[PDB]
């Protein structure tokens, strides 16, 4: 493993899903089996 860094423009890799960006605190809770969270434009913008 590595660490968990937030709030900087970083690279991430959660559950194979690759992407870069700022990992700001989230404000929405999902269903307790769901791993992702997506918008109308079908772009990943949330993850557990």
């Amino acid at each position: 493993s590595t660490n968990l860094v937030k709030n900087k423009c970083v690279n991430f890799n959660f559950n194979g899903l690759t992407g870069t960006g700022v990992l700001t605190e989230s404000n929405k809770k999902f269903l307790p089996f769901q791993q992702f969270g997506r918008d109308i434009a079908d772009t990943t913008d949330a993850v557990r």
């Binding site: 918008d39 434009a41 772009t43 913008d45």
Partner: peptide, 25 residues
């Protein structure tokens, strides 16, 4: 003008779909 405005209706910018602002505010 307000009664007319109220009737008319970043995620985009994930790919380079920036939106330049108008000139006349």
């Amino acid at each position: 003008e307000d009664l007319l405005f109220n009737k008319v209706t970043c995620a985009q910018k994930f790919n380079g779909l920036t939106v330049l602002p108008p000139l006349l505010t």
